[PDB]
């Protein structure tokens, strides 16, 4: 099964995420090496219980670059928890978001290949995320990028950003809003969010549009706009996983494909789509 690690090996020294049910810490482990120690606090109901260990036991099963690797778990002492590799620059939409225009298109494209290596991954192994999106990727100190937040109810409940069906709209297919049909082809459609999340430094998709706003604006064919300075062959990518018909979109496969052979060949990176500007600068 899972390693059972006793609490003695663990020491909690910063926290790093919290909830109303336990925190997630930074941690040692025992050279003692870091982690990320997530925590369920006394009093947990049995579905607590169920959905917590349950993301452990789905990380567990899978072993790949670009998906959070398990240490172990605490189950037979309380508080319970979960251990996993610690990523030193926490979520994608935050680290980008704090390091605007730091990075290269070269670097930004190498972590949307790497997410969509763990996409293809989890969609060969039959899971599907449903909640795909940059707050959910975590960055490690050589900048890979490893998909998190595991499990069954649990993730579109505790996200906040999922709404009330609790989905968290913009980063959505249309068919999992419409009829709550979550497949690897919606999570599709949130990687190219992902993808426009990525070359705009974590800039809010659809930015103030209200929730009925985007879903309006979706339906009515309207797509997010080219980022400035994306490849164009990335703006081509992001809009082929946004098209209404799930069957057309590109499989995992196919995006991890066209992702590698751009890396490759990188010259092909440096032909940028327009982009369209909210603003002219007229000097004479
Ligand atoms: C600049 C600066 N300073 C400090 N002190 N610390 C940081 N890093 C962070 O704040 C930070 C923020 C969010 C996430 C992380 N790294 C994480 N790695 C693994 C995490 C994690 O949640 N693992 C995990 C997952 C993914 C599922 C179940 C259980 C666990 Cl334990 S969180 C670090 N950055």
């Known amino acids: 099964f899972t390693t059972e690690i006793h609490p003695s090996c663990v020491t909690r020294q910063k926290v790093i995420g ?12 025992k050279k003692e090496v870091p982690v990320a120690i997530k925590t369920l ?27 959070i690797r398990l240490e172990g778990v605490i189950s037979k002492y309380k508080p319970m928890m979960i251990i996993t590799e610690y990523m030193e620059n926490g979520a994608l939409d935050k680290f980008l978001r704090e390091k605007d225009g730091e990075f290269s298109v070269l670097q930004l494209v190498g972590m949307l290949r790497g997410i969509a290596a763990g996409m293809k991954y989890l969609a060969n192994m ?21 998909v998190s937040d595991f499990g069954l109810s649990r993730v579109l409940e505790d996200d906040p950003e999922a709404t009330y069906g609790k989905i968290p709209i913009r980063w959505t297919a249309p068919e999992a809003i419409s009829y709550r049909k979550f497949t690897s082809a919606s999570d599709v459609w949130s990687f190219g969010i992902v993808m426009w999340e990525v070359m705009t430094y974590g800039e809010r998709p659809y930015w103030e549009l209200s929730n009925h706003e985007v879903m309006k604006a979706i339906n009515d064919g309207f797509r997010l706009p080219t980022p400035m300075d994306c490849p164009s062959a990335i703006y081509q ?9 799930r069957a057309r979109r590109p499989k995992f496969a196919d995006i991890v494909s066209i992702l590698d052979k751009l890396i490759r060949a990188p010259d092909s990176l440096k032909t940028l789509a327009d982009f369209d500007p909210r603003v002219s600068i007229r000097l004479p």
């Open 126 to 146: 039959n899971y599907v995320h449903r909640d795909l999106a940059a707050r959910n990727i975590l960055v490690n100190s050589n900048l890979v990028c490893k």
């Open 18 to 29: 919290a909830g109303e049910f336990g925190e997630v810490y930074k941690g040692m482990l």
């Open 41 to 67: 606090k006394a009093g947990y109901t049995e579905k607590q219980r169920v959905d917590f260990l349950g993301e452990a036991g789905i990380m567990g099963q899978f072993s790949h670059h670009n998906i």
């Open 237 to 245: 990518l992001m809009m082929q996983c946004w098209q209404q018909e």
